[PDB]
Structures are given as C-alpha cells and as structure tokens.
Amino acid sequence: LPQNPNAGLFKQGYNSYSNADGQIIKSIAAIRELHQMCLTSMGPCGRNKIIVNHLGKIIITNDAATMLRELDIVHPAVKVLVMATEQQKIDMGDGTNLVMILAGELLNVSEKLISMGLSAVEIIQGYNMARKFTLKELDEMVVGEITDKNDKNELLKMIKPVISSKKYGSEDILSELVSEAVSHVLPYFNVDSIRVVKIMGGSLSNSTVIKGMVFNREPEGHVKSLSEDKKHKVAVFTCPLDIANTETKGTVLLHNAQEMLDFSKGEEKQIDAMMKEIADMGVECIVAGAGVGELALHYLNRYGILVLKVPSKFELRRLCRVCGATPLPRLGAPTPEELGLVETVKTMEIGGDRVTVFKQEQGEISRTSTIILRGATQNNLDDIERAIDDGVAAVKGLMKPSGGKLLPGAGATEIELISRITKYGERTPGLLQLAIKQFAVAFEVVPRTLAETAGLDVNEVLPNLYAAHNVTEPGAVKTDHLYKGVDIDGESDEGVKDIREENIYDMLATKKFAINVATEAATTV
Amino acid sequence: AKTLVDISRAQDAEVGDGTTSVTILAGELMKEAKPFLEEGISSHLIMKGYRKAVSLAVEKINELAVDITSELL
Amino acid sequence: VFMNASQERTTGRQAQISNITAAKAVADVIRTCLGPKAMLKMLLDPMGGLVLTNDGHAILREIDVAHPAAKSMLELSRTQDEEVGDGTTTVIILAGEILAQCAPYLIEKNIHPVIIIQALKKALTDALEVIKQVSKPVDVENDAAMKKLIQASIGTKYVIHWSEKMCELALDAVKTVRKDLIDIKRYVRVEKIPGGDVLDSRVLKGVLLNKDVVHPKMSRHIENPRVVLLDCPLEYKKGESQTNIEIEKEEDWNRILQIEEEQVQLMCEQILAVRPTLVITEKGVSDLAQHYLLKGGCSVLRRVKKSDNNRIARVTGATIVNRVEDLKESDVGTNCGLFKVEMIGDEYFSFLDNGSGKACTIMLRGGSKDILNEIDRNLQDAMAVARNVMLSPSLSPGGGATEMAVSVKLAEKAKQLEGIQQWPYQAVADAMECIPRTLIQNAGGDPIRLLSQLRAKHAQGNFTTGIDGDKGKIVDMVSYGIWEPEVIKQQSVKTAIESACLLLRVDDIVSGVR
Amino acid sequence: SRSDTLFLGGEKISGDDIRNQNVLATMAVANVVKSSLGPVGLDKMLVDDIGDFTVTNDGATILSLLDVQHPAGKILVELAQQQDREIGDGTTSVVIIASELLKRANELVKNKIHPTTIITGFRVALREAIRFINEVLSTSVDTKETLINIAKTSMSSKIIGADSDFFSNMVVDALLAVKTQNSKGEIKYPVKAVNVLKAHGKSATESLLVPGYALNCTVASQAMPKRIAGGNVKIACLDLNLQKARMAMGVQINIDDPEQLEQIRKREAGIVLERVKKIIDAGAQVVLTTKGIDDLCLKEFVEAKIMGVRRCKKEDLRRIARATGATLVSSMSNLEGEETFESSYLGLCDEVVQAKFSDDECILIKGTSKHSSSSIILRGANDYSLDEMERSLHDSLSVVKRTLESGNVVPGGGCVEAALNIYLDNFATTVGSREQLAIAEFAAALLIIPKTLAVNAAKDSSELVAKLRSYHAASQMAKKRRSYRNYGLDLIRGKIVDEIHAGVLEPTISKVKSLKSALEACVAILRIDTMITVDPEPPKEDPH
Numbered sequence A: 001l002p003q004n005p006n007a008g009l010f011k012q013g014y015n016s017y018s019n020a021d022g023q024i025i026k027s028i029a030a031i032r033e034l035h036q037m038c039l040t041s042m043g044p045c046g047r048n049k050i051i052v053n054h055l056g057k058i059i060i061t062n063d064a065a066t067m068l069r070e071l072d073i074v075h076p077a078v079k080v081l082v083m084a085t086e087q088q089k090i091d092m093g094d095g096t097n098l099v100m101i102l103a104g105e106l107l108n109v110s111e112k113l114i115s116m117g118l119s120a121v122e123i124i125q126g127y128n129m130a131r132k133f134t135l136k137e138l139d140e141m142v143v144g145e146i147t148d149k150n151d152k153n154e155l156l157k158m159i160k161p162v163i164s165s166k167k168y169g170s171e172d173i174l175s176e177l178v179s180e181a182v183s184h185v186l187p188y189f190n191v192d193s194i195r196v197v198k199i200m201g202g203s204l205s206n207s208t209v210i211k212g213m214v215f216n217r218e219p220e221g222h223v224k225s226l227s228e229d230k231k232h233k234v235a236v237f238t239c240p241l242d243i244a245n246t247e248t249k250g251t252v253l254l255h256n257a258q259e260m261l262d263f264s265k266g267e268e269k270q271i272d273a274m275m276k277e278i279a280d281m282g283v284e285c286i287v288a289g290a291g292v293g294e295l296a297l298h299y300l301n302r303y304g305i306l307v308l309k310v311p312s313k314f315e316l317r318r319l320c321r322v323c324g325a326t327p328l329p330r331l332g333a334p335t336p337e338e339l340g341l342v343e344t345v346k347t348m349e350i351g352g353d354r355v356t357v358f359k360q361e362q363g364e365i366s367r368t369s370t371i372i373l374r375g376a377t378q379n380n381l382d383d384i385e386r387a388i389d390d391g392v393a394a395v396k397g398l399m400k401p402s403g404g405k406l407l408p409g410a411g412a413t414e415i416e417l418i419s420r421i422t423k424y425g426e427r428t429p430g431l432l433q434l435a436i437k438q439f440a441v442a443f444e445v446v447p448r449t450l451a452e453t454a455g456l457d458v459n460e461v462l463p464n465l466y467a468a469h470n471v472t473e474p475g476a477v478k479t480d481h482l483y484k485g486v487d488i489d490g491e492s493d494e495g496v497k498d499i500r501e502e503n504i505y506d507m508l509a510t511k512k513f514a515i516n517v518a519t520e521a522a523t524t525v
Numbered sequence B: 001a002k003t004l005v006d007i008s009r010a011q012d013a014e015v016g017d018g019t020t021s022v023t024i025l026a027g028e029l030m031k032e033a034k035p036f037l038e039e040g041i042s043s044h045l046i047m048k049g050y051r052k053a054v055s056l057a058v059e060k061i062n063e064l065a066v067d068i069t070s071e072l073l
Numbered sequence C: 001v002f003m004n005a006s007q008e009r010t011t012g013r014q015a016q017i018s019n020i021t022a023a024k025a026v027a028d029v030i031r032t033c034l035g036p037k038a039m040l041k042m043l044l045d046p047m048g049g050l051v052l053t054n055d056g057h058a059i060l061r062e063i064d065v066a067h068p069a070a071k072s073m074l075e076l077s078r079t080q081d082e083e084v085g086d087g088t089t090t091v092i093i094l095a096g097e098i099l100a101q102c103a104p105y106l107i108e109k110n111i112h113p114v115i116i117i118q119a120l121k122k123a124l125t126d127a128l129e130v131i132k133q134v135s136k137p138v139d140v141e142n143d144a145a146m147k148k149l150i151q152a153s154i155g156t157k158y159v160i161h162w163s164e165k166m167c168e169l170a171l172d173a174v175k176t177v178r179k180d181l182i183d184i185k186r187y188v189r190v191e192k193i194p195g196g197d198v199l200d201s202r203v204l205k206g207v208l209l210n211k212d213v214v215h216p217k218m219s220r221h222i223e224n225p226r227v228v229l230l231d232c233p234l235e236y237k238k239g240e241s242q243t244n245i246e247i248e249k250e251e252d253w254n255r256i257l258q259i260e261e262e263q264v265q266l267m268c269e270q271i272l273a274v275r276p277t278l279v280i281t282e283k284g285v286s287d288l289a290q291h292y293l294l295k296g297g298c299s300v301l302r303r304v305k306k307s308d309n310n311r312i313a314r315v316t317g318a319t320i321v322n323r324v325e326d327l328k329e330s331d332v333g334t335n336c337g338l339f340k341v342e343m344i345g346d347e348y349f350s351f352l353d354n355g356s357g358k359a360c361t362i363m364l365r366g367g368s369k370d371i372l373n374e375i376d377r378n379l380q381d382a383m384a385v386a387r388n389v390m391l392s393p394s395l396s397p398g399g400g401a402t403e404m405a406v407s408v409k410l411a412e413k414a415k416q417l418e419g420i421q422q423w424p425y426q427a428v429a430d431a432m433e434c435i436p437r438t439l440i441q442n443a444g445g446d447p448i449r450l451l452s453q454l455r456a457k458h459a460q461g462n463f464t465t466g467i468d469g470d471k472g473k474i475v476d477m478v479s480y481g482i483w484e485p486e487v488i489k490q491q492s493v494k495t496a497i498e499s500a501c502l503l504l505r506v507d508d509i510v511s512g513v514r
Numbered sequence D: 001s002r003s004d005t006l007f008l009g010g011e012k013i014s015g016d017d018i019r020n021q022n023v024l025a026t027m028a029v030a031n032v033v034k035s036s037l038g039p040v041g042l043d044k045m046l047v048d049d050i051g052d053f054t055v056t057n058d059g060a061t062i063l064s065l066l067d068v069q070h071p072a073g074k075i076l077v078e079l080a081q082q083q084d085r086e087i088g089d090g091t092t093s094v095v096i097i098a099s100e101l102l103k104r105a106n107e108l109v110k111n112k113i114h115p116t117t118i119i120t121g122f123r124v125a126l127r128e129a130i131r132f133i134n135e136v137l138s139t140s141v142d143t144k145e146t147l148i149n150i151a152k153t154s155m156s157s158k159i160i161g162a163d164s165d166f167f168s169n170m171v172v173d174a175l176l177a178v179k180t181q182n183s184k185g186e187i188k189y190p191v192k193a194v195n196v197l198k199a200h201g202k203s204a205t206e207s208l209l210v211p212g213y214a215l216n217c218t219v220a221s222q223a224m225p226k227r228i229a230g231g232n233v234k235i236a237c238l239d240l241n242l243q244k245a246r247m248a249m250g251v252q253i254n255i256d257d258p259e260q261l262e263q264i265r266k267r268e269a270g271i272v273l274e275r276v277k278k279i280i281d282a283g284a285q286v287v288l289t290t291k292g293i294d295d296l297c298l299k300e301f302v303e304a305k306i307m308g309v310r311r312c313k314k315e316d317l318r319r320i321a322r323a324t325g326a327t328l329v330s331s332m333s334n335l336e337g338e339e340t341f342e343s344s345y346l347g348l349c350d351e352v353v354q355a356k357f358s359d360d361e362c363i364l365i366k367g368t369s370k371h372s373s374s375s376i377i378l379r380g381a382n383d384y385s386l387d388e389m390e391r392s393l394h395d396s397l398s399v400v401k402r403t404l405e406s407g408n409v410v411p412g413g414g415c416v417e418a419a420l421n422i423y424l425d426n427f428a429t430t431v432g433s434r435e436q437l438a439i440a441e442f443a444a445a446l447l448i449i450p451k452t453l454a455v456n457a458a459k460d461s462s463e464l465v466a467k468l469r470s471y472h473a474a475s476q477m478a479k480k481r482r483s484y485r486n487y488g489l490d491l492i493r494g495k496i497v498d499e500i501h502a503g504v505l506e507p508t509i510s511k512v513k514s515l516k517s518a519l520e521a522c523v524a525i526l527r528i529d530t531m532i533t534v535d536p537e538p539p540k541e542d543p544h
C-alpha cells in the first residue's frame, strides 16, 4: 500500500536548497555556535582551547583567528565570518576577535529585527549607515594623544595591551622582549625582519633578545672551524663553495698519463687558489648559503676561518641584513664594498644544543634581530610567538603615520559607542531606526564579554558602565582584578585606534554578506 | 518538541478551539525569553518571574469580558 | 550542518577536570620510582623494546601518551634533560600533584582557572626566591664538591651498589674539557661493548673505536705514536663528476695504467713523509692502501666514525686534513701515550690512551644488552649534574629538604595574605610535599609520622633538613653528602608548574579524524 | 602470569585499581545528580531510547532510570531508594554524602593510611556527629505554622517551587485534616498516603483538593445517575463481584431425564440477582465493587437509580469504607444461615458526584462519617509535568508525615551540615595521631553538600560558603550568647541568613537516617580490595 509524495522539480545527483528566511534562522545559529566558543577566548582573563590537527598535531591558542585557522568548518555561512577573522589577521595583526564577536552579535541582534518584520535589504542599509557613523565617530572619539614613536617609551605602552590580551600575567616581561628586538632597527620599516627563535629549557622568564639572528646549526669544516672569534669581518655568498660545477652538461675527460697524473693536482691547485684569494681579503668568516665543497674545504679551516652551513634561501637575506655584507653569486672576485662586519660569531649552546649566533654589536648593529624564547612546553612557546607577532604587527601600524593614534580600549570605547551609536538612530526617521538601535546594543559584546570572563555579575557591570559615561576620557572600563568597574585611564590600558576601526569594519562587512544571502545551494562530497 | 505537540491536544480537550494558537504562543514564548537565560542570572529567577506574569495577564484577560445570553450564541 | 561529523568536544568542567585527572595518570605511574627505595620500570613498545631506564624522560617517552594534557608531562619532562640532567622524574610528580590539589577548589567552585592560574603563578615565583637564598658557593670549597653532588644523583639508580666507582668515573671525564670559567657536553664519548660488567667499565683517557680491515700484519701497538687524521679514499675512487679516460694509440693504455698506479703510489708515499705510526681517516682505503702502510709498520684505519675522528684530533692535538699533498708536520697528533688493540667481548677496540686532551672517551662494559644502556642513561643524568655543579657552584640541599623548606616559606606568606588567594597559596605549599611523600612511600618508613614530625621540626628551624633513610628518621641533608645542583630544584618547579597551569588554561578540546 | 582462576569472563581487580574503580563508579552515579539538589538546582529529562521522555528533579527516580551498571554504583542506587523508606526526601543528597565519604576515605588510603583506621575514623565521627544533632534538633520540637514550612522546603529545588506557598498547604491539610489512623494503640499519618490524581490540561495553581476520596472510575451503565448528593448517602463497598454465576468447578452438570436444562438455567442467574436485591434492599444509593457488575445485573441496580461502578480499585474501596464507616464486604454469607446484608454495612457520606476534568470524568465522594478523606487532583500542561508535579507531592507529603511522627526537626539549608563541619574537627580531634586525619575527612566530606548548593549558581560562590563557615564556627570558640550561630544559606539571595527565621526546615529523622546509611555504604566499599567477577552462562554455541 501507498503513499509517497513525488519530487517537485528534479536535478542532478543531490543538491541542497535553503529558503532564505529559514536559512537565516538556521545559519544565524551555525554562526552562533562558533560565537560562544570565541567569546571565552577574547580578552586577558579568558581561556584557551586546544585543537588537534587533521594530521594529529596539538595546538593551543587564545587568538580566535587561529582557532579557526586550525578548524575545518562546513557551514558556508560560518565560512564567511571565518574568512573575516582570517582576512584580517593578515592585513592587521590584532583585533581578530572583535571581528567574530561583533560579526556574530550583529547577526544575533539582527534576528530580532528580522523577526519583528524588517527585510534583509532594510536591515543591510540600517547597519551600513551605522558603519559609516561608527567609523567616523571613532576617528574623533580618540582623545588618546597620538604619541610620537621613540625608544621604548611609547612602544611598551602600546605593545603591552596587544600582548596582555591573551598571554595575561606575563604582559610586562613579554612585551619587554618585543620592544627590545624592535629598537635594534634604525628607523619605512620592515616588520618581517624581526624573526623569533624559541628553544626548550627553563622558564619563559629566562628568555633573551640578541641583536642578530640565531642559528640552530653547527659551523661546517668539522674540527677545523674556529667557532670563536672577535669582531671578525664576514663575507656571505650563494654560489657553491666547491669547484665550479657545470650548470649544464659537463664531465672530465683525460687522454694520456700526463693528463691523469696532473688532473688530480689541478683540482687541488684551483681549490687552494680560490680559497686563499678570499682569505687574504681579511675575510674572517664565510657564510655559505648554497653548497659546500669538501675538496676545497681543506683550505678554509687551516688559516683560521669560520664557515656557516647553507641556510635557507630566505634566511640568508635576513642574515645578511645583520652582518652588513652582501650576497654574490660565483666564487671569488670578492668586493670590499660588499663585505660586512660582524661583532661576534661564537658557538654557545642552550638546552644542550650546538648553536651559532650573531649576538651583540660593538658596533655596526644589525638591521634585524631575533628573540630567544626559553620554555618548558612546545605548545606555550608557540602561542607566545603569536602574542609576539601580534605585537610585531602593532609596531607595524604605529610605524606607518598617522596610525600612531591611541584609543580607550579595555571596553571603554566599545562601551561609549553604545550610546553614541544610539543617538544616531535615535534621531534618524524611518524604519532604519530599529536597524540602528540594534547595531548599537550589538556592541554589548566587548563590555559583557569581559565581565563574564572574571565571574563578575554581568547584571552589575553593564549598569555601572552606563552610569560611567563619565566622558572624562573615558575614563571608564572594567578590570577583572578589582571591585565593581575599573578605570581605563589608570591602568595605562588603551587599544590602538586603527585596529578597532579595521575590526569594526570587517565585521560590519562580513555580517552584511551573511545577512545579504537568501538561498544557499550547497553541493555534495 | 514532544512536549509541545502534547499541549495541542492538552488544550483541545479543555476548550477545544485554541488548537493552532496555543502552540504558536507556547513556542514564541521561549524565543523572546531565551536571551534572558544566559544574560539572566538563572533559569529559576525566570520561573518566579513567570508567575507574576500569568497571574497579571489572566487578570487583563478578564478585563475584556462579554456576557452570553445563552439565537445570539 | 556544522560541526563536521565527527570530532569530539568536551566543553565545561569536563576538559577542566578530565585533563588534570587525566594528566594525573602518567603522573601516578612515575610517582613510585623516585629516591632511595626506587621502583625501576620495564616496557615493551612495538617490537622488542625491552628497555629499562629509570630516567623519567626515558620512561615518559615509551608511554607515548596520546592525551593532550598528558603529552604535556612527556614534554615537561623532555625539557629537564636539556637544562638539568637529573630530576627528570621529580618534575612530573609536582607538575601533576599541583594539578591534583587544584581539583578541590575547582570542584567546590565556582572558581575560574584564571584565578587558580595566577594564584599559583605567584606562589611559584615566590618559591624561586627561597631557593636562590639557600645555595652557598662555597663554604668548605673543594674539588670534591662536584663528586658528592653526583653521589646524590647516581644514588638510587641501577648503579648505586657499584656507584662509588661510577662516581669518580663521571667527574673525571667532565673535567677534561675547557668548560671551566665553556665547552660542550658531547666530547666525552660513551661506547657500548657487549660482554662485561658495570665494574669492568674502562675510562679511556683518550679515544676509542673499531674499524673494518683488509690486512692484520700491521703493528698492533705503538708507544707515543704519530697520528695523521687524513680523511680520504685511496683505493681508486672515481672522480666526482663523470670522470672518463678516452684513449688513442697502441702503447698509451699502459701509460695510463702506470699513471693511475703512480697517482696513488705517490699519495701513499706522501703519508710516509709525515713519519706517522697510525693513519686514521674518515673514508675508505682497502687493498694496497693497507698493504704498504702495514709494511712500514702502521695500522691503517677504515674511515673512522664521523664523531669518532672528531675526538681524536683534540686528544692528540692533531687537525684533520682532507688534503694529502699539503700535509704540514704540525698537523699530526702524538699525544697518544700507548695505542694498542686489546680485544674485549666479541669485538676489538682500538684505544688511544693518554694528557692535555678534551674527549675523555668511556668504553662502558655490561652484562646485559638492556643494562649497558641503562647505565649509559644512568650517567647522562650524572655527567650533566656534574657539568651544572661546575657552571654554578651554588648547591641546593636536596633530598626532599629544599622542598620542605620552600613549603614553610609559602605557607608562611599565605596566612598573612588571607582570602581566595590563601588556599591556592597553601596549594603549591602543600603539594610541595609531593616529593617527600612517595619519596618515603617507596622506601617504606612511615611517611605520615615522618613529615608530621619533619614539619613539626623543620618549622621551628632545620631549614636544610630532608628525609635521609640511611638511618631511618630525618636530618639535615646539609651535613651528609646530599647535594643537588641549584638549577635542578629551581628550574624544575617553574617548569612543572608551567604545565600545572597550561592544563588549567584549557576550556575544551576539539579533535579530528585520522 | 597467573595461572590463577578463572578466565575467560571471570576476572578480578586488585587493591589500588579496585579502590579506584570503586570511587570512580561512585562519583559517577553521584556527580550526575550533584546538580539537582538546592533551590538553585534544576530538573532533567531521561529518554526511553524509543523517543519517550521523563522530566524529573528527584534523585531517587532519576538514578533508577540510569540503570546503575556496576556494583559500586548500583550500591548507591540501593542506598537511594532506602532514603524514601526512612523519609521520602533527600535521596538526591544522601548519595552525595556517601560518595564524598568514599572519595575522601580512599584519598587517605592512597596516602597509605590503611582502611581499618579510616573505617573507624567515621565510625566515631558519626556518633559524635549525632551527639551534635542533639543540640540542633531539640530546639525544633515546639516551633500548623512550622508544618507548612517543612512542606514548603520540600517544594524548592523542585517544579512546584514556583507555587510553593500555594501547594504547601494543599499538602499539609489533607494529611493534617483528613488523614489519621490508629493500629494497636498508635497514631500515625498514612505512610501509604492519600489518593492523588492528575488532570490533563487546565491551570497550574488550580489543582482541586477534595473533602473526600476521588475513586477513578466511570459509571457502569449510562442509564445510572451521574450524581447523588444531599446528605446521609447509602454507600456500599461490595467486593462480592456481583456480576453473574457459573457452576462451582468440579461440580459437573449432567441432566436426565428432563427436560430440566432450562429449569436451572435461569436458576443460575436467579441466585445472583437474589443476592443483588438482598443488598439493594438495605440502602443502595451507591454500589462499589472490585470484581465488577454485569449487564444482566446492572439493569437491576440501574432501575433503582443506584450508582454502580464496575470493578473498582481494591486499595480504594478500603480507604473509602474506612471513612464512611461502611464495611467492605467480602462474601455474602454472614454466619449461618445468612443471605445477607445489614444497613449496618453501608457507609455515611454527603455527596457522590461524578465530576469532569477535560475529556475525562471521575466519581468523587465528598464528606464522610469519619472526617478523614483527602484527594488532591493536580492539573497542568502535559503528562510530562503533571507527573513530576506528583513526584514533588509524594516527596513532600512524606517530609511532613515523618515530621508529624517525630517531634524533633532540624534547621536545614546547609546549616546542620555546616555546624558538624566545624564542630567535629575543632572539637572531635582529641584522639589525634592518624585517627584524626580520618575524622577530619569525615567532617570535610559533609561540606560537599553546602558546596553544591552554591556551585549550582553560575556565579562565583566560593565565598558564600566560606562565610557559612566562620559564622557557624562562632557558636563555640575560638581564641550567655547571644548565640550568634544557627544561621544558614539563602541560595535565593547571596549571603547568610538565619534559617529558622525562614520557612526552611527539614525533619531531624531525615538528617539522621541519611547521615547514618551514607556511612555504612561507604564502609562496605572501603573493606573492598578485590572484586572477582565471574562470567555468566553463555549460549551453547556448540560446534557439534
């Protein structure tokens, strides 16, 4: 016996349709799933969640743009707000959480507006007209004196909040190393040069910053290498140190005895010839970047010359920018206008590992520096380099004028905005009023999210901040380490301005895409 | 979902007309009462808070009252 | 619908407790090995692992734990052997015990990790001070300060019965390199010989190695010899690049032949003009290569292990020279007092005795192939405790002493600092007794009476008083030869706790698929 | 290895592993219902793996639906259902105390304490603990006013908590007002309670108590009156099964020569009706059988306008007849020779009206000769709730009974469990040595409950409990009153408050029977070090 409903309109294999309103209710929740997971991650007094790669590797972070980096999602809608955080971490270092936090919330609050009666087009224009007002209003809500960049004074003041956010409790010591490695780059400046090298052993507090990069490698030439010098002049070059090998087809042919009896010698000749030539130039150290020849290595060890094995093509550069020399293909023909002086090239060992270094400069002073991070856990030492790269990106923005404009972070601004955005919609006729009063309360995230982190009764923290519009700066925030509501001004806690603007935009941009789509046709397999 | 579909017949027997409505109300009653759960202190503060609701509401539901003759029915 | 099917998630108190109580596992296993009444373990990984090393790292490596909050211990340990040799086992003890004593608050709470985390974060750096207060270099300063710091280490290992020998054994080799006032911890060489015994381990004051041969007519031994570190192949190794010899004419072949012969014939003679007694190279010469040098009375060498030959020049002062035709006369090594070939076990070692030489090679003999290795790893934990005993003449009064002392300090501070920070302060404080706990439980002497009477005394004085089961009861480990290098006790706490918080910094755990 | 015996399917764990597996198995069944207790606590839903659900906050019933795998867990389930027998409430909590006692006990032998020492450390701390109850419960003998408080405290941490005050009296009044018996010179309230039903649909608050029983039945024939009220009604609880009559078995019927098969066919029915009338002739306002009336014997009870109920609940007609003064008749014959019936068998009520309650109708019996009849007819949204509402009833009615059957009551709310915490450790530690550390844990294990009463609230409550400490410790020590102690937890609003000043109050009995059995369970498992578990009987699976 029957029955069975036929299929209205067929298609290929299998495809998934989604009625737009239903999808919005349904996909607005998918989005909401990764929200409650990103809430607890943002801010210092929060939490970090472990993640096990599809390859088995273990990863722990506070950063939400990385949580998703290691996360394999399926939801085409969630895919968006993930593309957001990720499409920001690259352009701007910090602020990756305020992305998701807002984005998610924007969608969350928009629901009410979508259910009330509004339409997606109406909701979009609503939010949009707020993104233009929230971006500008902030351009003046600053009041934070755009401090000029010099030494470690202004740096440590900014670089701390960027760090104290996830690696809370080591804010002071941490950022110290950051600003340290920074001030070794004579001020347009490149962020990439400051590389980081972490090595197991001891507690993190025993880390150090050396003017120059560190190599987890031993000096070639065996027991014939010095591995210890004083103020030696170096000369780095790519071309293989060994004999001049035929890049194209090439071999060795001999016809008569005289040929053979001498061919063996000829090599020895050229070898020593090439070497001594470069040695006489006063070259105290040859940093091989590509290829090493034992045949001719015979020479270099005897006079008393170092030899750093062939690093990566990309690591030779950042190295050279430390020495002062310059790379040069082909062996021989050294140019003193291409030579560089290196302070010390000793062979120290941390955690019992043979290592060579460029630490300290009398001296010429390196243009690139590296941080040596000692630790006890592979995982932590990794989510420390992150809290560092965040910082290295904060100094990347302050270095490009006039982004060096401070701003009341710690929720302060993210709270004042609540009212400032309300007024706009409070005095704008039309149905768009609602769509604005929502975008406003959307910023309830940062406030509450901080409170809920510390066990603070959220029902008190919010009201307190509202009363404290003080407008002193503000001047008004919440520190998990006190009573009631804290004062941003005091702690010297302020989040860089431009980062917030980027966050407030990328979210309002992404949240709009999710709102904009009506039907999703997902495939299979 | 099995508790809701139960209120349907749970209501139909008692009066027998509020079939479609009781479900539509019961449901939406939680949707606009949800964000007060997490943001709200507890699930029990909301309980007591609902009594003062049904009490008052039943009152207002009595204000708009009409008398049946017992033709005009 | 997300999330992808399927990958496990523990949100809530789950991961919060099922990670600490899960880390406790591996931390519950090793918690028996430590101190005088030690409990060495054996384990068979895939294939016949058959390895029995008491090195807490060596142990936690074989468990190959898969749990995140557990692989943290197999990591918090792995580090130890990088900074400080010994103590590898004791870290985990606390590393976990901390996690352990964090459960009570965390459960009756209503208390976020962040609170507990920083709560210990203070106590930790607080204890780090008290330690830096106790070490004193050096009251009765003597070259024996290191020697007795090793008898504190080797003690309660698979060598303790025969230890006073393996004590002077370690020290000697350590003091052969210029690390005094910097020098690697590799140069001492640990060799493995089949048969024998712990007691029959030789401390070669030079070099050691075996090699392939082609003719034994060579002289087996030479007194105060001349050693050339050649590094070449002489048989007739083909040229690097495609080497070919195209020919013309009837009577040329032989010319090429006698030429080839000549080419090598010369090189060989070149060695002679150096007046050596034993040619040691890193590559292969077989056949005529040996023959001639043997006629001259020189034991030819097959290429000598890479790290092998790199010991020989330093001991002999020679310098390895890959070139033969420019061999100077000041590149050879004669430091060898007596070089023989005394056969041992089923093998035959070439020992270069004698010294002014850095690599104090040790040819360690054993009775079982699974024990020779348990002794090796039983000196890596020593030679390093020696190395650090030199680098920092600051010595911690170990033996569960530095712990019982730190506790009183932390316990002292916590009372004045009352509040929700008092408990977590009295945490690392109490949990600091983790060591003296099973340190005695392993032995047998009552622990509870011992610490209830150890605290009751150590509290009113006896700042450096540990539990010495030599006579039962407890006394100042400062008097007896109980000395643990500073770095060990210090660095360990900072490390054991580093994870004792990381595993609390955990919200949930999300997995994957294969 | 081994050889030992015997595998497979038969194995055994030893010392540590067991003492652990036992503790884990206990925290398991424990930690599930560790959220339930306390006003701040919630309810749960259990799935009949066939869709069917069941929402409940009761700890006992909740653990039953779990399935209790393992000896240690099921041991707690067994300890649970014990509590209902003692009391009726606290099942959710007793399990916790026990579990915590093991948890700690083992955490001591894990410190090489040895069980014997511990098993005594409780053995004593328990006796002294009750010796402290002698100071707390006594003052709670004098304090209908405080009976509605106990019935109300049995509402919180429950669904009917929202309507506590309302149902608080519906509970008290039926037992207090209409539910008293007397057997062998003893006065007690129904430990088998008073009929309670459920009305599908309708208002929450509007659950109708009844001035009489509520026999759940429908009128035999539609032709019968749906109600017979007024006053002095003729009730008859007849378990005669007056339906029909068939030959007495073994008494075959072989006829001849007649022609008389009919002369007795009707005679088979006659003797039936003859008894039916003999009873109808004494009153017959309402007839209530257990076996049931027959169509050919209803017409007779119908024409006389006598309400007849086919096949009632035997457990009812008893309780009903006991109140109306009637006499649940078994067999017709009364001595010999007797038919029989006497108007002295019938009952005395006021109204016998068959009411209606949403697509359903039950006959009520209002008013009685002896004024002891109560039936609470609940009414809510779904069966899913109307049932659980009854659980809060069966679990609250009890708290009162136990109370009114023992003058001594106790300041609950974490109060008692707090005083003991401080009192034994501060004052029990006279023996000292090792035995001290045992007693200690026994006291510490008591905080387990006050703790969870707080942790149930998402907010940081680590402090709210810390205060309950200092406060209670204040009664004596340290370093003419007015006694500043006797306070308790106000889960509803943070911070301490005197519990006696509040409706909160738990029967002393409950605080004892639960404190005591929680120990025996713990002990019994402490003594365990090896669990030999032999496989059952496998299927033949014979290759031949």
Ligand SMILES: Nc1ncnc2c1ncn2[C@@H]1O[C@@H](COP(=O)(O)OP(=O)(O)O)[C@@H](O)[C@H]1O
Binding pocket: A041, A042, A043, A044, A094, A095, A096, A097, A098, A099, A160, A161, A162, A164, A165, A166, A409, A410, A411, A446, A450, A478, A479, A491, A493, A494, A495
């Ligand atoms: N004392 C503080 N120092 C630094 N940040 C603080 C401090 N107090 C609160 N915060 C929070 O830390 C910042 C945000 O946390 P973060 O994890 O960096 O989010 P995001 O990097 O995506 O912007 C602040 O703007 C604020 O909300």
Ligand SMILES: Nc1ncnc2c1ncn2[C@@H]1O[C@@H](COP(=O)(O)OP(=O)(O)O)[C@H](O)[C@H]1O
Binding pocket: C033, C034, C035, C036, C054, C055, C086, C087, C088, C089, C090, C091, C152, C153, C155, C156, C157, C381, C398, C399, C400, C435, C439, C467, C468, C469, C470, C482, C484
């Ligand atoms: N004479 C001693 N009496 C009691 N305990 C000792 C004595 N000497 C050493 N110990 C204990 O053993 C050492 C700890 O080593 P441990 O980390 O447990 O394993 P291992 O010695 O193999 O590294 C300490 O010195 C101390 O806790």
Ligand code: BEF
Binding pocket: A042, A043, A063, A064, A093, A094, A095, A096, A097, A098, A162, A165, A166, A390
């Ligand atoms: F959360 Be931010 F990106 F540090």
Ligand code: BEF
Binding pocket: C054, C055, C056, C085, C086, C087, C088, C089, C090, C381
């Ligand atoms: F085993 Be020890 F701690 F190295």
